[PDB]
């Protein structure tokens, strides 16, 4: 996260770190949606152009974390993956359309002060909150700038951007399954995701029921925090049929 600030303790208790084994490194962010299901971006797991193709045994899920690099004994919980499910129409070739994957954990994770699931929106929550100008929040342990790494989890709040402005900021074809967010060059505030934040959550707090909803997944940007560019996020509500289908089936 570029131009964010340090998270408060327990501020994002759904945040998950995808941690690579051998060699020990941050793979990506993710989010806890139940005691056995973790949501992330497909390109964190499968992306042929960068030779990424991780299997269940390649990584661990670290939940309840604050420090990036420390083993947070008695706080964080580490889980093994039972199974990865990538959206079957994930378009890694063209535009990262449907950049979404689920992971089922071997064993349920115990909830605590530091570990708690986020809600997923329904159609009505999407319609209320996914409006240009409405702000959400992006968290992760990714890089502090484009070209270094934080000691603790970083947070930034960012406005949702009008769809024509999103499209006019990029050469890539933007689909209805994606939204963009970030400040415009004039605005006097900045901020963005950056390498290692992908797969993390864009959350909003419903003013109707005072719960946090994951509206987006950190997908991609052209660089990080560039003037006139925005971050592109997977629209979680638009892919919820698939999410419900995987969870109900498996």
């Amino acid at each position: 996260i570029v131009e964010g600030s340090d998270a408060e303790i327990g501020m994002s208790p759904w945040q998950v770190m995808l941690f690579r084994k051998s060699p020990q490194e941050l793979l990506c962010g993710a989010s806890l949606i139940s005691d056995r299901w973790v949501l992330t971006a497909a390109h964190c797991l499968l992306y042929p152009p960068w030779d990424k193709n991780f299997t269940e045994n390649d990584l661990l899920v670290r939940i309840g974390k604050h420090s990036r690099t420390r083993y947070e004994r008695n706080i964080e919980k580490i889980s093994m993956l039972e199974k990865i499910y990538i959206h079957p129409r994930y378009n890694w070739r063209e535009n990262l359309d449907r950049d979404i994957a689920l992971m089922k954990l071997k064993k349920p994770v115990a909830f605590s002060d530091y570990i708690h699931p986020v809600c997923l929106p329904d159609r009505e929550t999407a319609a209320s909150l996914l409006q240009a100008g409405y702000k959400g929040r992006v968290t992760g342990w990714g890089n502090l700038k484009e070209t270094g790494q934080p000691s603790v989890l970083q947070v930034v709040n960012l406005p949702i951007v009008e769809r024509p402005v999103c499209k006019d900021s990029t050469r890539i074809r933007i689909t209805d399954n994606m939204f963009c967010a970030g400040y415009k060059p004039d605005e006097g505030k900045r901020g963005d995701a950056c390498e290692g934040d992908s797969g993390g959550p864009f959350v909003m707090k419903s003013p109707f029921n005072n719960r946090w909803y994951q509206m987006g997944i950190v997908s991609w940007g052209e660089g990080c925090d560039r003037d006139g560019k925005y971050g592109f996020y997977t629209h979680v509500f638009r892919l919820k049929k698939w999410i419900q289908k995987v969870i109900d089936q498996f």
């Binding site: 501020m11 605590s112 530091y114 909150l129 100008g133 709040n157 719960r211």
Partner: peptide
């Protein structure tokens, strides 16, 4: 049932330092 309610915030009716910035954007 209890999704999206943070033990150290909503559950204790404490606000984090920037959540009001989010609220203020929701018209």
């Amino acid at each position: 049932a209890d999704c999206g309610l943070r033990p150290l915030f909503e559950k204790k009716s404490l606000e984090d330092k920037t959540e009001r910035e989010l609220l203020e954007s929701y018209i």
